[PDB]
Amino acid sequence: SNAERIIHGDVLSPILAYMRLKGQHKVILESIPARFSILAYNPVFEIKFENGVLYQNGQVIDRDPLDFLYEVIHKSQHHSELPFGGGAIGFVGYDMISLYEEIGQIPEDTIGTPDMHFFVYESYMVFDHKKEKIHVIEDALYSERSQEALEKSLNQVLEELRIPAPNEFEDLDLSPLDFKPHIAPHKFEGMVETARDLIRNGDMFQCVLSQRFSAEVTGNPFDFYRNLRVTNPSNYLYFYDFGDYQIIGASPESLVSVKNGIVTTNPIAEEDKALATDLLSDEKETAEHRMLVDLGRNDIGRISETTSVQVTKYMEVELFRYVMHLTSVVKGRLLPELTAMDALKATLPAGTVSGAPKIRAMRRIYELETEKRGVYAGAIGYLSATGDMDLAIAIRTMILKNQRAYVQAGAGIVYDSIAQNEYQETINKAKSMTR
Amino acid sequence: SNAERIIHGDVLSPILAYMRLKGQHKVILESIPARFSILAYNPVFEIKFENGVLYQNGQVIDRDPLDFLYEVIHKSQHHSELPFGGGAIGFVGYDMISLYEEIGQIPEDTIGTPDMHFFVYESYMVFDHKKEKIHVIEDALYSERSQEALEKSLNQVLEELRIPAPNEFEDLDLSPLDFKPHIAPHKFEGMVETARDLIRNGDMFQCVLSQRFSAEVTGNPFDFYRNLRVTNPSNYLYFYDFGDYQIIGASPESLVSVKNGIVTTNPIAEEDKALATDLLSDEKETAEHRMLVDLGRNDIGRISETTSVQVTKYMEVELFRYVMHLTSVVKGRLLPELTAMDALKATLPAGTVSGAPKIRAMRRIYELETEKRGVYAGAIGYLSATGDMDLAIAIRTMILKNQRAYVQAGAGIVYDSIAQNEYQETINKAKSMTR
């Protein structure tokens, strides 16, 4: 009396269904009371920093990695009204900050990602979801390609788009992973204890300690991304294929953005309204948030005209679908001699993945953690050829490499932390992606 | 230095693009901070009322058309948690009310649509856009098909969905139409004058007079729908293919809905907030809205438990993208012996397309208008096998028939109406679809 097939929503629209269906007397009835997606391919350059050496398409470059990246990416005469408009897409690892601060000896790397990896693109698509328009772009920013070459590349992309992938309607290959901890539960609780005691002795105020977990990869990584973007709609979704490793994530927390010379940070730290007014109390949670707002005011203030720093939205309440947070917006006008790289260096890594005071907390983290953080707790996003930039904090991010899947999550240790609670908080956060 | 192709957003998603693109080093970066679409095909029955005769698949039925439609559609033991779940999709023409009220002689029909036309479906898809899941359904409500037959039908639908239509990436064939009026501008102004004088003489309070326009069809009707759903995202979008005619519309105004025994109506009648508080003044516009709320209270009250009628949202302000309106919600508990048909008969046609008092205004409309209204100012939507129902007012609706495209729009004539202003209001409204 009933038969049903469920199709995932990302491979069929009601228009496509109507055009393809061959049945009689077809009718459509709809109720219609997502911002941008960037897809990039065929990069002109790979820019990578690993083992203390800077590479461009395999050639050694004797330059600072961030100064070189900006110099190669930024095109003064280039303008565009799309969010990305060409440029670099990639990440900056947590450990990049060791080039600019003395954080001590970096522990053993059990994953092996480079400290920085960007691809540089002049061939890309931008989905303007609000306008329901797709911009397929071939540009000559980095190659000086002829207009004839742009048109050929564009025609080839369009011909590929007409041809269906053979597996478009197969069900998602979401085999679940068996994640194993990288440290003993009791060893993490001892680390929490050590950090807690330092905080009591006046060494610092807060220290984010993290645990890593990993599993032998099973199933399809891209299908995990397809499911992730339905179950975790964040301001940042990303699937980066670097060839021998992939980065897949749904970070809800921006690290920093630069847009037309403006630097912005977004501090994040009746049953609806119930826990809402409770959250606006709790002098511990508001103090947490205020502390992050003030960190953003100072970070932006160091690189801006000092009287341009504005808190434009303050401790308003934003309710996600697994946890609740207080939200604010801090903005300033970048000084004329500085660039997005200075915005990156001023904020990396976020206070919520390091601690306060940040430098002391970072030294303590690497006296306690036994694995180099790598991608985790760094910055992920793009640097546009316009010099605009948008970077997410690399939390809620999975690394696929060495035939394993790595996830990692931290907890802010304070003076009254309970080690067992923070072990639990850490494994729940790290594995909430895994669903 | 730049080449670009724009693809319409309804034939490609970023997932589909990723799977189909063959370029090197593909990355996706997205920002993701629409309710339902119903597609139905291969109907079991056609139910139609034309020229005073009721037909089911061509056979004459000696029954009242609405009682018969409900009897055929409603299945007591059937339940489903999707909005439609099977049933009838179609329209009820304005002139159907002549079966239940004496509105006088109906003028000449220059279009020739039936007064009622529904297709009855057990094969359909529901796009649950919020969950990003597509439900492809084959049911045995009306046929008693075996489970083997459902599975074969479903497999055939799925095989059709895998095969791209050959024109999926062609640009929209939106040739613009040259619409011609069906009456002289001065004749409409004389009708307005006649109605205005009647209102002054105490005959009635308000009378909606309409103008029709039509053009020789050029271009593709479906591509017009594809563009319409991007430029007019209403609670009601619909493309109905009846074979020798099509109905395409974007009505923003619900006529009436029935859901689990509850009948609902939705009376519709800093630059943001500026014209907002101005709208909450203007004792003429609020009086207009209040009048529609009270019409809904009485309509629902006649078919409900009288102390269950509730105004649950009152004269709150809703801002669309071409005009602004005051909005309210009226609900009641349908009496146990009545059905959605009684809800339809209690509300058809909406006060905003007829007048006050409604019966006198309808008699006057057909003393002044020279063409049968037909689809215009009736009701469009579905009747579910559960007995639930959702009907839009048939405004902002285009009829494609006789190789012409017909649009129509009305204006509420009151005691101080200016005939030239109402002629203008009418042609602007009727043609705002045409874009």
Side-chain angles (χ1 to χ4, degrees), chain A residues 1-76 78-269 271-272 274 276-317 321 323-435, chain B residues 1-76 78-269 271-272 274 276-317 321 323-435:
Chain A
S1 63
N2 178 279
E4 172 188 64
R5 203 73 50 101
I6 309 297
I7 299 185
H8 215 243
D10 56 5
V11 300
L12 192 59
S13 75
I15 298 306
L16 286 180
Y18 196 94
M19 293 173 147
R20 296 176 187 176
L21 284 180
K22 303 294 185 174
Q24 301 172 34
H25 306 292
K26 285 145 49 165
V27 296
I28 316 181
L29 177 58
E30 303 189 83
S31 188
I32 302 185
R35 207 148 306 184
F36 294 104
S37 301
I38 303 153
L39 209 166
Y41 35 87
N42 295 319
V44 174
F45 300 126
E46 175 189 68
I47 301 180
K48 143 205 292 183
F49 193 67
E50 70 186 343
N51 302 320
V53 177
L54 179 61
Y55 300 90
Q56 183 185 30
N57 283 15
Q59 314 186 259
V60 167
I61 276 72
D62 187 38
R63 295 285 300 286
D64 169 88
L66 298 184
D67 293 350
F68 186 72
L69 173 76
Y70 191 83
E71 176 181 302
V72 162
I73 293 324
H74 176 56
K75 297 294 173 174
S76 302
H78 172 75
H79 57 87
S80 171
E81 79 301 345
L82 304 169
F84 171 62
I89 300 174
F91 70 90
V92 174
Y94 171 94
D95 304 275
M96 284 289 302
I97 195 58
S98 68
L99 297 192
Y100 311 99
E101 305 291 346
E102 271 172 23
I103 67 172
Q105 180 163 2
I106 299 180
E108 173 195 356
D109 187 350
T110 56
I111 298 183
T113 45
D115 297 285
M116 180 185 83
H117 206 163
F118 284 96
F119 290 118
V120 184
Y121 299 92
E122 54 185 28
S123 312
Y124 61 96
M125 305 170 57
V126 185
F127 288 72
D128 186 346
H129 295 300
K130 197 165 184 300
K131 301 283 192 51
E132 285 299 320
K133 288 300 185 288
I134 307 176
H135 300 259
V136 186
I137 306 281
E138 293 287 340
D139 206 310
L141 290 174
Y142 303 106
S143 61
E144 317 294 320
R145 280 189 291 171
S146 83
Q147 184 73 33
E148 289 176 345
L150 308 171
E151 215 55 44
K152 270 185 76 77
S153 298
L154 185 54
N155 287 330
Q156 286 167 344
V157 172
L158 291 195
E159 187 42 54
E160 290 173 4
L161 292 177
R162 282 179 81 250
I163 300 175
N167 52 323
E168 278 175 16
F169 286 88
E170 312 298 334
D171 308 83
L172 288 193
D173 184 10
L174 299 182
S175 182
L177 300 152
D178 184 14
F179 280 95
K180 311 285 190 171
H182 281 209
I183 69 184
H186 153 268
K187 239 196 83 59
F188 183 74
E189 299 178 274
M191 299 171 188
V192 174
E193 166 251 342
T194 303
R196 194 196 66 242
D197 287 348
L198 289 165
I199 293 170
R200 316 255 208 170
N201 207 30
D203 179 73
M204 49 179 170
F205 180 81
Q206 174 152 207
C207 184
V208 182
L209 299 173
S210 68
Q211 280 192 254
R212 175 173 295 165
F213 305 82
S214 69
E216 300 172 292
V217 298
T218 174
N220 188 331
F222 188 67
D223 286 349
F224 176 83
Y225 182 69
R226 295 172 60 193
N227 191 60
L228 185 65
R229 59 202 291 292
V230 173
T231 69
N232 295 82
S234 300
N235 266 342
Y236 302 97
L237 288 152
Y238 39 88
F239 183 92
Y240 292 179
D241 188 356
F242 291 99
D244 57 334
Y245 70 101
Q246 298 75 46
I247 294 177
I248 317 174
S251 174
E253 303 191 14
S254 173
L255 173 78
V256 71
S257 72
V258 184
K259 164 91 168 309
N260 295 332
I262 311 304
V263 187
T264 300
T265 61
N266 178 231
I268 301 289
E271 32 161 5
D272 241 15
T277 60
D278 189 17
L279 178 60
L280 291 177
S281 74
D282 198 341
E283 313 180 30
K284 241 176 62 187
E285 297 276 10
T286 59
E288 270 272 318
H289 179 85
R290 197 175 316 120
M291 217 141 285
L292 219 72
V293 177
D294 288 336
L295 193 70
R297 289 173 59 230
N298 178 247
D299 286 344
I300 291 179
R302 292 198 312 278
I303 61 171
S304 301
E305 202 283 286
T306 53
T307 66
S308 74
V309 181
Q310 307 186 329
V311 180
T312 66
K313 199 169 293 190
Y314 182 53
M315 213 165 59
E316 282 164 23
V317 31
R321 309 308 235 196
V323 73
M324 208 177 187
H325 282 112
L326 298 159
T327 191
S328 299
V329 178
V330 190
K331 291 171 172 302
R333 187 176 307 278
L334 193 62
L335 290 163
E337 69 279 8
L338 309 186
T339 72
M341 303 295 85
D342 305 290
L344 168 58
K345 292 197 278 178
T347 55
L348 177 76
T352 49
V353 300
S354 47
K358 190 180 286 188
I359 287 167
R360 172 71 51 92
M362 288 185 303
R363 294 190 55 103
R364 298 305 193 194
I365 286 165
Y366 271 172
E367 294 169 358
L368 302 173
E369 291 186 359
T370 61
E371 298 174 281
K372 178 176 179 194
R373 282 180 166 196
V375 169
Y376 167 76
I380 301 182
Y382 67 84
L383 172 73
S384 178
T386 67
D388 287 350
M389 186 179 67
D390 190 8
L391 291 178
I393 307 173
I395 60 184
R396 298 250 306 276
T397 298
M398 178 185 294
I399 314 306
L400 265 64
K401 192 179 185 311
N402 314 311
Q403 312 273 115
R404 293 186 73 75
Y406 306 89
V407 294
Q408 186 157 2
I413 311 309
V414 284
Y415 76 93
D416 59 337
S417 279
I418 304 161
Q420 176 65 42
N421 295 9
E422 312 287 31
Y423 163 79
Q424 217 61 66
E425 179 68 21
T426 260
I427 184 165
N428 299 329
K429 273 208 289 178
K431 285 179 181 184
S432 61
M433 282 188 77
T434 307
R435 302 193 152 90
Chain B
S1 63
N2 178 279
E4 172 188 64
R5 203 73 50 101
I6 309 297
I7 299 185
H8 215 243
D10 56 5
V11 300
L12 192 59
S13 75
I15 298 306
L16 286 180
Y18 196 94
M19 293 173 147
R20 296 176 187 176
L21 284 180
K22 303 294 185 174
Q24 301 172 34
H25 306 292
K26 285 145 49 165
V27 296
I28 316 181
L29 177 58
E30 303 189 83
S31 188
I32 302 185
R35 207 148 306 184
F36 294 104
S37 301
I38 303 153
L39 209 166
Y41 35 87
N42 295 319
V44 174
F45 300 126
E46 175 189 68
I47 301 180
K48 143 205 292 183
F49 193 67
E50 70 186 343
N51 302 320
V53 177
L54 179 61
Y55 300 90
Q56 183 185 30
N57 283 15
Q59 314 186 259
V60 167
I61 276 72
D62 187 38
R63 295 285 300 286
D64 169 88
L66 298 184
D67 293 350
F68 186 72
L69 173 76
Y70 191 83
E71 176 181 302
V72 162
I73 293 324
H74 176 56
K75 297 294 173 174
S76 302
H78 172 75
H79 57 87
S80 171
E81 79 301 345
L82 304 169
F84 171 62
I89 300 174
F91 70 90
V92 174
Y94 171 94
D95 304 275
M96 284 289 302
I97 195 58
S98 68
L99 297 192
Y100 311 99
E101 305 291 346
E102 271 172 23
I103 67 172
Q105 180 163 2
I106 299 180
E108 173 195 356
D109 187 350
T110 56
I111 298 183
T113 45
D115 297 285
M116 180 185 83
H117 206 163
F118 284 96
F119 290 118
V120 184
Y121 299 92
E122 54 185 28
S123 312
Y124 61 96
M125 305 170 57
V126 185
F127 288 72
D128 186 346
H129 295 300
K130 197 165 184 300
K131 301 283 192 51
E132 285 299 320
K133 288 300 185 288
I134 307 176
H135 300 259
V136 186
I137 306 281
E138 293 287 340
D139 206 310
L141 290 174
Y142 303 106
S143 61
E144 317 294 320
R145 280 189 291 171
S146 83
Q147 184 73 33
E148 289 176 345
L150 308 171
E151 215 55 44
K152 270 185 76 77
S153 298
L154 185 54
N155 287 330
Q156 286 167 344
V157 172
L158 291 195
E159 187 42 54
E160 290 173 4
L161 292 177
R162 282 179 81 250
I163 300 175
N167 52 323
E168 278 175 16
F169 286 88
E170 312 298 334
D171 308 83
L172 288 193
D173 184 10
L174 299 182
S175 182
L177 300 152
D178 184 14
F179 280 95
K180 311 285 190 171
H182 281 209
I183 69 184
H186 153 268
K187 239 196 83 59
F188 183 74
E189 299 178 274
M191 299 171 188
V192 174
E193 166 251 342
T194 303
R196 194 196 66 242
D197 287 348
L198 289 165
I199 293 170
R200 316 255 208 170
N201 207 30
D203 179 73
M204 49 179 170
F205 180 81
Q206 174 152 207
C207 184
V208 182
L209 299 173
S210 68
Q211 280 192 254
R212 175 173 295 165
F213 305 82
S214 69
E216 300 172 292
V217 298
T218 174
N220 188 331
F222 188 67
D223 286 349
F224 176 83
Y225 182 69
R226 295 172 60 193
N227 191 60
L228 185 65
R229 59 202 291 292
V230 173
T231 69
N232 295 82
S234 300
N235 266 342
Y236 302 97
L237 288 152
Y238 39 88
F239 183 92
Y240 292 179
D241 188 356
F242 291 99
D244 57 334
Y245 70 101
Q246 298 75 46
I247 294 177
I248 317 174
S251 174
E253 303 191 14
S254 173
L255 173 78
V256 71
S257 72
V258 184
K259 164 91 168 309
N260 295 332
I262 311 304
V263 187
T264 300
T265 61
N266 178 231
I268 301 289
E271 32 161 5
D272 241 15
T277 60
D278 189 17
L279 178 60
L280 291 177
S281 74
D282 198 341
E283 313 180 30
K284 241 176 62 187
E285 297 276 10
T286 59
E288 270 272 318
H289 179 85
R290 197 175 316 120
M291 217 141 285
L292 219 72
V293 177
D294 288 336
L295 193 70
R297 289 173 59 230
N298 178 247
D299 286 344
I300 291 179
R302 292 198 312 278
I303 61 171
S304 301
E305 202 283 286
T306 53
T307 66
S308 74
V309 181
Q310 307 186 329
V311 180
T312 66
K313 199 169 293 190
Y314 182 53
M315 213 165 59
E316 282 164 23
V317 31
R321 309 308 235 196
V323 73
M324 208 177 187
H325 282 112
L326 298 159
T327 191
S328 299
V329 178
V330 190
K331 291 171 172 302
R333 187 176 307 278
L334 193 62
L335 290 163
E337 69 279 8
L338 309 186
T339 72
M341 303 295 85
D342 305 290
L344 168 58
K345 292 197 278 178
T347 55
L348 177 76
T352 49
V353 300
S354 47
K358 190 180 286 188
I359 287 167
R360 172 71 51 92
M362 288 185 303
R363 294 190 55 103
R364 298 305 193 194
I365 286 165
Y366 271 172
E367 294 169 358
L368 302 173
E369 291 186 359
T370 61
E371 298 174 281
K372 178 176 179 194
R373 282 180 166 196
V375 169
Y376 167 76
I380 301 182
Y382 67 84
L383 172 73
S384 178
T386 67
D388 287 350
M389 186 179 67
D390 190 8
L391 291 178
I393 307 173
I395 60 184
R396 298 250 306 276
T397 298
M398 178 185 294
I399 314 306
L400 265 64
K401 192 179 185 311
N402 314 311
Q403 312 273 115
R404 293 186 73 75
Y406 306 89
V407 294
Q408 186 157 2
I413 311 309
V414 284
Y415 76 93
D416 59 337
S417 279
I418 304 161
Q420 176 65 42
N421 295 9
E422 312 287 31
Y423 163 79
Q424 217 61 66
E425 179 68 21
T426 260
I427 184 165
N428 299 329
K429 273 208 289 178
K431 285 179 181 184
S432 61
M433 282 188 77
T434 307
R435 302 193 152 90

